[PDB]
Design a protein around this ligand. Structure first.
Ligand SMILES: *C/C=C1/C(=C/c2[nH]c(/C=C3[NH+]=C(/C=C4\NC(=O)C(C=C)=C4C)C(C)=C\3CCC(=O)O)c(CCC(=O)O)c2C)NC(=O)[C@H]1C
Ligand SMILES: *C/C=C1/C(=C/c2[nH]c(/C=C3[NH+]=C(/C=C4\NC(=O)C(C=C)=C4C)C(C)=C\3CCC(=O)O)c(CCC(=O)O)c2C)NC(=O)[C@H]1C
Lengths: 310, 308
């Protein structure tokens, strides 16, 4: 008390965070469910899109891009996709990401933030970040370089490299932060801070962001997968509404924006790049992707160093 | 030292798929490519001595001043460019670099395509996974060649490793069934002479989308600081040795791109890409190919086996 930790079904909250929209599609692209904010940011209104083809809802270019993406052999758990609608109004572009799960195709839409951000310049800077990281030659220094790069690209107040021990307790082994915030370097945390069902989720889905912990959830309606007759599994949805217990925990330490990226050493959860901001901090899909690439390169380095000996 | 002698860094010309402008440190226009009127409606004659502010829009001028002002590294970076002009305004995909006391801008008209080229992140994520699963140098190079071919669509992608005498061997390859294999062939050092090699050690990417291009003169071809021809070593548009052009014409490949594989300071090898037809490589693509080369070189280093 609390020892009910592992029991919360965090993957089926029936709701998302309000900063994007979510549509759930059948394989033939009929809309089966949608976030209740679909009228505002866009159409009008769920009961109105339900049963319509997503293809009569978005762009001709978007439908083509999605058909290409979904035909691409080798699963992948989805990817970015540029999305546009034209409506009675009414022409909007979104940063989309799709994914397949639970026998549905999900489309999440985020309005493009930060306001350019020339992508060619951003790719070049990502390459340079990767170069600095790959030049580190010890575990702490690779971890510190990783935290510095992520901090640089995301502007987060405090970026921490959290390493799991064999019992899933953990320690902050590297950190880059603004001098105004507290250091967590060297601090140890028990396993129950990230309970077993979260660790499972974070092994299969390596990126999460909660830009404002004080958000009001938006329901997904109907919250019923027609393929299962049960609530829709939002495990792979970037917009998934998270456990209220975690949000209380964040409020408790005074950080209203958070993101973390799993560091996967093979198929195993080695640690996290954990990021805290004092106020809300929205991070574009492109920047989240750069942070994922950083964790991927860092994981590879960690493995090479682990194979050293002997 | 005979194939060594061609002054490849000073051709006084570029390839016609972009334009080049050269600016003094105070941003006045020093020189530009003769296709300015065709691509922009403005003449070089009307541009020499004029300020960058007086020529590009304010947002471009800002981006560029900020990029150049950034302290520390970078020979250069990508930049989005628009022109001020009475006839209106045109957007270009830009890079700048600094070299020989000049600042260069290279600009290409924006991509217009019926096709859907692949995305930087997905392509790099997938390439690292594959490289990482590899357990030998040869398999790591083959994964690199296969990823670069997938990203680019090139008919043949080869990993060319230099020996200590700077001869070379194609140690991995991916190709379409329609073109011959070069896998396991050795080539003499003369195929990439000493001055090209030195260039390719400091400037790691080269692209010749159409080897039968009509070179476009840079005017004036005279650096005001230096009284010598404009040094285009870091220009991605530089017009390339016509000897190397004929070398490709002779093997029927009309589009090429290569990326250096660098091991610290040493030119270790090339990712060499051949296409039968001209091949204009998407800008996101060339960056992904560059990152593949950097991660491969790291991996080659690891397999070399530690910390000096
Ligand atoms: C009994 C329930 C508890 C609990 C539940 C819980 N916690 C999470 C998710 C996270 N917990 C995190 C822990 C840390 N962040 C840090 O910075 C550090 C130390 C440096 C630790 C130990 C992290 C990073 C997450 C991921 C989310 C994020 O990045 O902010 C969940 C799952 C939330 C969700 O995905 O729905 C749950 C159920 N935490 C507890 O302390 C006890 C009371
Ligand atoms: C005496 C002059 C000769 C000569 C000159 C030359 N060659 C280059 C540049 C390249 N040569 C290349 C060689 C290969 N490409 C391949 O695929 C293979 C086989 C696997 C080989 C040996 C390459 C890759 C380049 C870089 C350009 C590219 O990627 O297409 C230059 C310099 C061109 C320039 O940068 O201006 C010169 C002067 N080559 C000869 O064979 C003799 C006759």
């Amino acid at each position: 008390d609390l020892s009910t930790c592992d029991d919360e079904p965090i993957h089926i909250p029936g709701a998302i965070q309000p900063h994007g929209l979510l549509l759930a599609l059948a394989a033939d692209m009929t809309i089966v469910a949608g976030s209740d904010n679909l009228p505002e940011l866009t159409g009008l209104a769920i009961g109105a899109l339900i049963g319509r083809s997503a293809a009569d809802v978005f762009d001709s270019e978007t439908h083509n891009r999605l058909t290409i993406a979904l035909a691409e052999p080798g699963a992948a758990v989805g990817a970015p996709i540029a999305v546009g609608f034209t409506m009675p109004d009414g022409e909007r572009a979104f940063n989309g990401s799709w994914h397949r799960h639970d026998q549905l195709v999900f489309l999440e839409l985020e309005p493009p933030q930060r306001d350019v951000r020339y992508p060619q310049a951003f790719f070049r800077s990502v390459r340079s970040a990767i170069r600095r990281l790959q030049a580190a030659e010890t575990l702490e220094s690779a971890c510190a370089a990783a935290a510095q790069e992520v901090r640089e690209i995301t502007g987060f107040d405090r970026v921490m490299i959290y390493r799991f021990a064999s019992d899933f307790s953990g320690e902050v082994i590297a950190e880059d932060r603004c001098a105004e915030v507290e250091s967590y370097l060297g601090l140890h945390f028990p396993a129950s801070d990230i309970p077993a069902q979260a660790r499972r989720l974070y092994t299969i889905n390596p990126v999460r962001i909660i830009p404002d912990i004080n958000y009001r959830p938006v329901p997904v309606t109907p919250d019923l997968n027609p393929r299962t007759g049960r609530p829709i599994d939002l495990s792979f949805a970037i917009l998934r509404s998270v456990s209220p217990v975690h949000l209380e925990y964040m409020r408790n330490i005074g950080m209203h924006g958070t993101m973390s990226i799993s560091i996967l050493r093979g198929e195993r959860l080695w640690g996290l790049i954990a990021c805290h901001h004092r106020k809300p901090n929205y991070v574009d899909l492109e920047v989240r992707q750069a942070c994922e690439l950083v964790a991927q390169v860092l994981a590879w380095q960690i493995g090479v160093m682990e194979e050293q000996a002997l």
